Write a protein that binds this ligand. Structure first.
Ligand SMILES: Cc1cc(CNC(=O)[C@@H]2C[C@@H](O)CN2C(=O)CC(C)(C)C)ccc1-c1cncs1
Lengths: 141, 86, 103
């Protein structure tokens, strides 16, 4: 369902990373498979060649935390008007406090030691349930 | 309009009602003071700071900064956020 | 430009915002509405410094980029009990435990 259209109509795009994270851009190819591309450091940008109707989403390259692009999940390059590239503003969402706490705990404790932490059983499963591109694609679909 | 959120160690935090209603748990606890017996003040102060942060940056075009959390308070803050559903 | 504050006395802590251009006296009017004590029975402090009513919060060092939503600036508060003002006193928050072995 979520797949790039094979339009063959070039569309130049500026990936603008306005987040403090290292960004992993992911191209959903014609069979709907996530295809990773080279990372962007925090605050940097790149001019990239894509195509009209192609699907892109963006993540934290280390933890796969979800990021927004122009205030949304998905970015689809549009027609270029007067030779101007499309701007893809990559930003942090407003994470829930809970998820933000899970992010920080994950980043300090190695997966092996989640069960060693002194917390209720249900938070153990919340920690192990890492952000994942395949999982989100099943949600969106 | 304001409400009082009281930590386990007696600290009384006064925040706006609409900020506090971010938490569905607090909405229920109100329906104008709320005593939290498991949340110490160093956690509850951070919870209040988050409310201000969420209300400010939700549906905002201005670049959003990371919400900071110290390593020392993360576990306790996780437990509170989980309970408060925020 | 909005600034974000914690107005703190004893074990009380008010979370609110104000304009950088607003006055110390106007902040006292906000406190009055919440804690039911008029401006003349209040002293506001930045750290150990007493704040003048007619000065703006910007002049007193509360700026939008330092007094942030996620990390608000502290403004000391002291009440006048009858004739004389109490000394400024802010109870500190609780201390977090030691970082567990795994963190
Ligand atoms: C290294 C790099 C190369 C390219 C080349 N362009 C592509 O691969 C485009 C992007 C996407 O629309 C698919 N694509 C294609 O040329 C079609 C295809 C992969 C040959 C089937 C585009 C972006 C990047 C990036 C550079 N930094 C972050 S992404």
């Amino acid at each position: 369902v979520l797949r790039s259209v094979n339009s063959r109509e070039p569309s130049q795009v500026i990936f603008c990373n306005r987040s403090p994270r290292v960004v992993l851009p992911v191209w959903l190819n014609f069979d709907g498979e996530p295809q990773p591309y080279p990372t962007l450091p925090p605050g940097t940008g790149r001019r990239i060649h894509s195509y009209r109707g192609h699907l892109w989403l963006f993540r934290d390259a280390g933890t796969h935390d979800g990021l927004l692009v122009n205030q949304t999940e998905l970015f689809v390059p549009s027609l270029n008007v007067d030779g101007q590239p499309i701007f893809a503003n990559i930003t942090l969402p407003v994470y829930t406090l809970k998820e933000r706490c899970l992010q920080v705990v994950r980043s300090l404790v190695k997966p092996e030691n989640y069960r060693r932490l002194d917390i209720v059983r249900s938070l153990y499963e919340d920690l192990e349930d890492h952000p994942n591109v395949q999982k989100d694609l099943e949600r969106l679909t | 309009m304001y409400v009082k959120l009281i930590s386990s160690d007696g600290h009384e935090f006064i925040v706006k009602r609409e900020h506090a209603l971010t938490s569905g748990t607090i909405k229920a606890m109100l329906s104008n003071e709320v005593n939290f017996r498991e949340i110490p003040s160093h956690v509850l102060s951070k919870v209040c700071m988050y409310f201000t942060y969420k209300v400010r940056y939700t549906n905002s075009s201005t670049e959003i900064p990371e919400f900071p959390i110290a390593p020392e308070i993360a576990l306790e803050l996780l437990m509170a956020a989980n309970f408060l559903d925020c | 430009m909005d600034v974000f504050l914690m107005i703190r006395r004893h074990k009380t802590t008010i979370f609110t915002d104000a304009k950088e251009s607003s006055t110390v006296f106007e902040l006292k009017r906000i406190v009055e509405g919440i804690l039911k004590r008029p401006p003349d029975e209040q002293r506001l402090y930045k750290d150990d410094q007493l704040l003048d009513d007619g000065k703006t919060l910007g002049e007193c060092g509360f700026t939008s980029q330092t007094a942030r939503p996620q990390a608000p600036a502290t403004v000391g508060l002291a009440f006048r009990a009858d004739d004389t003002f109490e000394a400024l006193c802010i109870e500190p928050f609780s201390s977090p435990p030691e970082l567990p072995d795994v963190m």
